[PDB]
Amino acid sequence: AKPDGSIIETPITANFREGLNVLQYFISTHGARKGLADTALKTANSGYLTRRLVDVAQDLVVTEDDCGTHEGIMMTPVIEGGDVKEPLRDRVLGRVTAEDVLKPG
Amino acid sequence: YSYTEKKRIRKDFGKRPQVLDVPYLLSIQLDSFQKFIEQDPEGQYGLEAAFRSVFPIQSYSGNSELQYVSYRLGEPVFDVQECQIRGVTYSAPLRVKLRLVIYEREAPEGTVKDIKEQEVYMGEIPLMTDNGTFVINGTERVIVSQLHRSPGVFFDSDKGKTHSSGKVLYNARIIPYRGSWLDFEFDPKDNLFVRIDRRRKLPATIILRALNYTTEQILDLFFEKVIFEIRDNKLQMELVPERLRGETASFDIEANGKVYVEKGRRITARHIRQLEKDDVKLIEVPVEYIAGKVVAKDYIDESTGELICAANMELSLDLLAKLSQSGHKRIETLFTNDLDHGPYISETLRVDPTNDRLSALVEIYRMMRPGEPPTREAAESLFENLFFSEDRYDLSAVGRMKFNRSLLREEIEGSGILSKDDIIDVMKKLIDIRNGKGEVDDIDHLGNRRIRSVGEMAENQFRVGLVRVERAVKERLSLGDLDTLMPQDMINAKPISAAVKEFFGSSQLSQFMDQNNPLSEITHKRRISALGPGGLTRERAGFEVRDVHPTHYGRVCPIETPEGPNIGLINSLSVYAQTNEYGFLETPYRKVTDGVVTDEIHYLSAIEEGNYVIAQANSNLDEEGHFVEDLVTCRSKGESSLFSRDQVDYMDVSTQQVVSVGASLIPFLEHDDANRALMGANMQRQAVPTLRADKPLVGTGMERAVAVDSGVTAVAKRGGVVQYVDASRIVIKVNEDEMYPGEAGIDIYNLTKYTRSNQNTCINQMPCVSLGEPVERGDVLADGPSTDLGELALGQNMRVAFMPWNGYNFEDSILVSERVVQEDRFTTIHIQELACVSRDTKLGPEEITADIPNVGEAALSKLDESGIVYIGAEVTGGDILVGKVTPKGETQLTPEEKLLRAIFGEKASDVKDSSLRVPNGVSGTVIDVQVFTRDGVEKDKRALEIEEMQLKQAKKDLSEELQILEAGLFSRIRAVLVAGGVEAEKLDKLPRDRWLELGLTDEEKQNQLEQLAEQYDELKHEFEKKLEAKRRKITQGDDLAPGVLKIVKVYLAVKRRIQPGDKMAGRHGNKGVISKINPIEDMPYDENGTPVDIVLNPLGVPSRMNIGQILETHLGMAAKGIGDKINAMLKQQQEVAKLREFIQRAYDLGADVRQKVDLSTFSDEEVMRLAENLRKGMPIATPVFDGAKEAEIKELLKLGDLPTSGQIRLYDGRTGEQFERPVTVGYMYMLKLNHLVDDKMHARSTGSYSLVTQQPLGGKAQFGGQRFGEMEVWALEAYGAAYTLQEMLTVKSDDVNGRTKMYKNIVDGNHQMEPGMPESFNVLLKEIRSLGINIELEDE
Amino acid sequence: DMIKGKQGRFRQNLLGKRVDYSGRSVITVGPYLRLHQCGLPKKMALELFKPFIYGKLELRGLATTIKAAKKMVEREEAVVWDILDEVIREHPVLLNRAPTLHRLGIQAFEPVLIEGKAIQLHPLVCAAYNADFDGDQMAVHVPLTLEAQLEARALMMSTNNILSPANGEPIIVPSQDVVLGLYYMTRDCVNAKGEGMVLTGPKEAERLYR
RNA sequence: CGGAGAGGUA
DNA sequence: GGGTATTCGCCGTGTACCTCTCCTAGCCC
DNA sequence: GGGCTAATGACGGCGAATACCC
């Protein structure tokens, strides 16, 4: 990527095992600089966000073994776009059933 | 050629000769300050411009004017070295010729009296040293150059203002060099709003109302007129073919009498072209189209002059009928279009709540100053001052130039104040940019950003001081006598000197120079900080400004910037970049005439660079100046592209001018990732100078330039033959062709020996010359710290194997051989400075003495009778360095104190101990004691001793000068006395000073004897008065802050040895922590049996993308092999010619390589010196983007009789068996960073606590506990870590009762806790109660 | 203005809420350490566990007063080294990374005394700490009461935190170096020394390779 | 151990 | 009328360490 | 001597107070 994030027309035709042209190394420098600045900025933002999240949920502690609630949430293997991106097993794994599921038919 | 170059030739693998040699790399600082401080024949940057802007001063009444005439810089009372060693500033006094003129009172202009105050003292300005630094409080400080928005016109885009409508808006900002900013921004309603500074928005035309403009004038100035002729039916309109490019067809557009464009159509380019080729002048239009337009001016009746139509209101059928019946033929209506010029000013006038100058001024005064009931005169004065007074709003020359360039004027200069024409131009082009005819200006473009170096900031703050003193003098001239009184009487030294000192000492760009390496110095002085006053802020984010720019190329280094949260703001200037005359950054480029790239250079500025196309330094040049490739890689606006060799306009002067000095030092930079190479360049500046400097085997060639251009290198000011070599002094017998008229004799270079630079690091200069060695001007007489033979010596070359040895080197961890510690290399000298100030208190003045109340004699054993520890004593933490005592206010003894002193036999004193004790955790040897005693304070034994040594040094220098002068004088008097009768016998038989007691026959010879005798006497008085002046300089009191009597600074030297844990890193971004020092036998060994010094993790290369170090290894292994192969040749004492062809072949290896050949050096002595310097490897110069290829490294390996593949099968010296495959072994250049594990370690259990809270903090004798923040509190909360939080927050941190109880419990032999009530919450409770907000406890 | 804080009320937990019996050092790799162990400098152990040394010295009769204990610890003789061994043998300490993004960013280990000047971290645990031995610097915190030691051993000992608390699946995993060694072992060739012969178990396999 | 500014580190 | 649609202030700003300065002064009594 | 003694080149978010077409 170049500044504004668009892809340069001419890629880095060489690599580290051969001489990088002056322009090629300068272009790679833009990506490196953007990555480093992004890491710093996201470090600050993520620190602040986890601060907020700890603030909101500090009081949440499991205090009862059972509540006898028959309401719950539906789990389906997430198919976003046109293909499944997460199987049903993982989201259902580790959970506690809300109603006794049946067989399809 | 250089003589120091002959003593060690560094092989270069560069393939293009350096067309432009590397200029002086501190030229920015020196040029800036010389432009600042030199005399001016015309008003230009410097003290002259500031004075000419602020002076003359006119009083309120009396016509008493204070006029400037000239200024001269007073000779500084001290020179740089004595300024540093005395702890005082290095400043030049400023003195000015002033004339106070009182004119006729009262009559036409004419003077009555003029009084001259010549050379008035108004303060001393700090003076820049030849290096480019400033001494302020005895320390070298650097004014970091600033990058800021250049004053002028900036058309930027306001984004994010959607309001469910999207659309990016525009903004035009006027930036003066001094004064109030101006803002013309747009709104979603396309109404122009004006802000002065950041004050609240006003309609655009209000200032036009304040600028004496009617609605008619405002409408005339911006919008175009449209003709309405009262004729035919429904009126006709004078058609303009270039008026329908954006308009829609809402009326019958006819041509030749027939309608060409019908109503409701979209007017196309075809319609415009048809109307152009028809050349129709007027067209009949419906009256409804007339009613939709807005008249541009008022229209009145012709009989009675009654207003019927007025500007800024739309047309209507009634108004048209009224004007037709009153009598009209020409109607001047406004032009409106939603793509091109639209009714932005018209709607602004409609929204504008004022219609005359007075109301506009009143409103402007009100929104400048809330409250403050406004008067017309006050508003007029404020508006004139903020925009039309040349003492409150100035653009300066660069501001005016950029202002004209932004508005596209041919002028390059103009008035410093804003004008009506300038504002209307800003209006017109901002409306154009809304129309799409203009283009928004980049915000980080180096052509839109400017460099304020030291001179500009100094003159700005000095003009501020001038404004303060002019306020004072204006007050005093009218308050006091209008008659004779000397101008020195009402100009105070406090304002100007205070402002200048504040700038040079406590600014945010006046930084302590990072001084641990010559690279650190040279990067710090070349730093470009976008921060500072008038620029960015650290908390910007900023993603636009942090990012590198296409024009950021070749001016500031893209791979040199801190990793911290200020990346992309603090750059380092490129190697060849320099500030323009106005403050922009310009880079040299070789001009390409037709195809030939000539050696002539042009410093293209950022804006000028974009216009032309720039070819790269790559694509080498064959024949005179033609590129090898017909299609060459170039950059037209910042993007790489292919361009014809006959279509280029400029080319890079060199291949190193796109990186900083720090980045240019990394070899094989074209083989590391930009991130990793950036990191490595960052660690290079943090390298601490090693115990003995040693050349890098694989360098770039900038080592010599960095060493010489830095001030750490003792460079021969004048050439000659070295008369006297010493570890502390270098005395050069200057050549006769470099002598000043008369005689000046020797040139003396005193050597900086073991001085704390800025970072508690030792800097000393190493004499690299010997007696009788012929030297010339510009060569290295003595090697500075981290410099060997005039080449930069940041780190040390080391034997390295790349393989994962038993997982002791796991991520980037580093395995060090015991032989590294055996060689005492990567060992450093650290000099800590400890200052003890003997002050004068209201209870009595403090004293420096060996008598310390109630202390053991063991500590005082190393203390002299003067009260200061000997120079050379080994001291540890807790001992006394300076024996300070403070007069006790009163002697009060607690009964507990009496009980303790009865048992322990303690004494009672009327003076309390306040002596400077060594910090608990450091040790070392006292190497330098500096005593600062101002006038009026009696000298003691130690001060007299240090003064005596300084006097002896100065006397020795002046005495050697006297010896050479008197030797010449005695030679000539003896030659004369031989004439007129031979008398050469008795002079040999008598002392050479007794020849003045011998007479001669009365001749011209006798007269010559007499005149040479009086010359001898005059030289004696010359030496006497020079010695007296030096004695006054060294003996006189130095400047101290009020209240302090003496300042004793003690320097402690610690020999810090490398050990497991120290952060030791390579050039390429390769990092590491020393894992452990395994014995040398445990280290692996090759077939010859040579153990490997360093083991690096091979796993760091396939991820961190720095394989240049791998190449650095291979090219190292060859180079040291060339060093080893000749070393064996040295051991056999082989004949000189053999070494000659060996070195000639070694340097000749390579294709199209510029290094030249021998024998041009001397046949035997110079060849032997070169071989002796080459026994420890052979230095290799590798330009960053023009370095050695793989084939060259393989050839050098082959000449070394070593594996051409670069891998030799080691034997694991730990167990003694070879591995399944050979490993990569070679010599790599490792840097020992200033992140020593000794300085980083700490822990504590019990110690200091704050006086406001019981949190543990304080000093470094026992630093407080480590800051277990809320993040780690959450980390414990995620676990079932519940008690651990309570101990780590209540009993281990705050509860003093808890702390004591738990300490007693653990000492008693159990681990139990008290719950406690932390004092931090008690403090919060108390201060909540302090605001009248109640806190109470619901008691259980 | 100092009621208000950034971030959070200052002196309660940030900024800064410092704590005694804590330290900080650069970290080195110790590849000889068991997963429940860390290498801690001898000087750091001495001046961290000072009250423990005082108590043990006064209990064992090696000192008669707190001043004697101070003299004994500052002299750093060989006698106090056995005392420190006793007090460190079972007593664990918490290692902590300054940017803490999850609970595994602080973990308890058994401190193993090492000569040197830096702390040794288990190679497997650096992934949990998100710490790379590139100059990164760790902190140590010493639990004092029984409850703290028991609780650190039960929950915050690295052996008890072998599974990530965010999504399951283990977080301590051979990363690069042991990975390379294992991969080098388990590779196969088509022809090399000792091919097509028959062996009984790994014993003479080790015998034949080594 | 009262508080600001700068650099470097992670 | 009413719902944007601005304009006017308040506010937030990872972590932790090292080093370094640099610390109410004007003034009429 | 001294005892009183007196700015934007931030950015994004957001609540409060009016602002403006239909």
UniProtKB/Swiss-Prot annotation, chain A:
Practical application: Co-administration of salinamide and rifampicin or salinamide and myxopyronin suppresses the emergence of resistance to both antibiotics.
Task: Write out the coiled-coil annotation as residue ranges.
Answer: none
Protein modification: Acetylated on several lysine residues in the presence of glucose.
Q: Which domain of life is it from?
A: Bacteria
Q: In the UniProt annotation, what is the result of changing residue 11 to S/T?
A: Resistant to antibiotics salinamide A and B
Q: What is the effect of changing residue 35 to A/C?
A: Resistant to antibiotics salinamide A and B
Reported impact of residue 36 to R? Resistant to antibiotics salinamide A and B
Q: Which residues does the record give as Zn(2+) 2 binding sites? A: 67
Q: What does this protein do?
A: DNA-dependent RNA polymerase (RNAP) catalyzes the transcription of DNA into RNA using the four ribonucleoside triphosphates as substrates. Resistance to the antibiotics salinamide A, salinamide B, rifampicin, streptolydigin, CBR703, myxopyronin, and lipiarmycin can result from mutations in this protein.
Subunit-structure text: The RNAP catalytic core consists of 2 alpha, 1 beta, 1 beta' and 1 omega subunit. When a sigma factor is associated with the core the holoenzyme is formed, which can initiate transcription. The rRNA transcription and antitermination complex (rrnTAC) consists of RNAP, NusA, NusB, NusE (rpsJ), NusG, SubB, ribosomal protein S4, DNA and precursor rRNA; S4 is more flexible than other subunits.
To which protein family does this belong? Answer: Belongs to the RNA polymerase beta' chain family.
What name has this protein been given in UniProt?
A: DNA-directed RNA polymerase subunit beta'
Which source organism? Escherichia coli (strain K12)
Task: Report which gene this protein is encoded by.
Answer: rpoC
UniProtKB/Swiss-Prot annotation, chain B:
- Quickly give the catalysed reaction: RNA(n) + a ribonucleoside 5'-triphosphate = RNA(n+1) + diphosphate
Q: Could you tell me which InterPro entries the record lists for this protein?
A: DNA-dir_RNA_pol_bsu_ext_1_sf, DNA-dir_RNA_pol_bsu_external_1, DNA-dir_RNA_pol_su2, DNA-dir_RNAP_su2_dom, DNA-dir_RNAP_su2_hyb_sf, RNA_pol_bsu_bac, RNA_pol_bsu_CS, RNA_pol_bsu_protrusion
Biotech exploitation of the protein: Co-administration of salinamide and rifampicin or salinamide and myxopyronin suppresses the emergence of resistance to both antibiotics.
> Per the UniProt entry, what is one GO biological process?
response to antibiotic
Stated consequence of mutating residue 675 to H/K: Resistant to antibiotics salinamide A and B
Question: From what superkingdom does this record's organism come?
Answer: Bacteria
Q: Which keywords accompany this UniProt record?
A: Acetylation, Antibiotic resistance, DNA-directed RNA polymerase, Nucleotidyltransferase, Transcription, Transferase
PROSITE patterns xrefs? RNA_POL_BETA
One annotated GO molecular function: DNA-directed RNA polymerase activity
> Among the entry's GO cellular component annotations, what is one?
transcription elongation factor complex
Record note on what altering residue 811 to K does: Disrupts the enzyme's active center
Which residues get modified to N6-acetyllysine? 1020, 1198
Q: What is its EC number?
A: 2.7.7.6
Q: What class of enzyme is it?
A: transferase
Gene3D superfamilies named in the record? 2.40.50.100, 2.40.50.150, 3.90.1100.10, 6.10.140.1670, DNA-directed RNA polymerase, beta subunit, external 1 domain (2.30.150.10), DNA-directed RNA polymerase, subunit 2, domain 6 (2.40.270.10), RNA polymerase alpha subunit dimerisation domain (3.90.1800.10), RNA polymerase Rpb2, domain 2 (3.90.1110.10)
> What's this chain's function?
DNA-dependent RNA polymerase (RNAP) catalyzes the transcription of DNA into RNA using the four ribonucleoside triphosphates as substrates. Resistance to the antibiotics salinamide A, salinamide B, rifampicin, streptolydigin, CBR703, myxopyronin, and lipiarmycin can result from mutations in this protein.
Assembly and partners? The RNAP catalytic core consists of 2 alpha, 1 beta, 1 beta' and 1 omega subunit. When a sigma factor is associated with the core the holoenzyme is formed, which can initiate transcription. The rRNA transcription and antitermination complex (rrnTAC) consists of RNAP, NusA, NusB, NusE (rpsJ), NusG, SubB, ribosomal protein S4, DNA and precursor rRNA; S4 is more flexible than other subunits. In pull-down experiments interacts with CedA. (Microbial infection) Interacts (via flap domain) with Escherichia phage lambda antitermination protein Q; this interaction renders bacterial RNAP resistant to transcription pausing and allows it to read through termination signals.
Describe the family membership recorded for this protein in Swiss-Prot or TrEMBL.
Belongs to the RNA polymerase beta chain family.
Q: Which HAMAP family match?
A: RNApol_bact_RpoB
Q: What is this protein called?
A: DNA-directed RNA polymerase subunit beta
**Gene that this sequence comes from:** rpoB
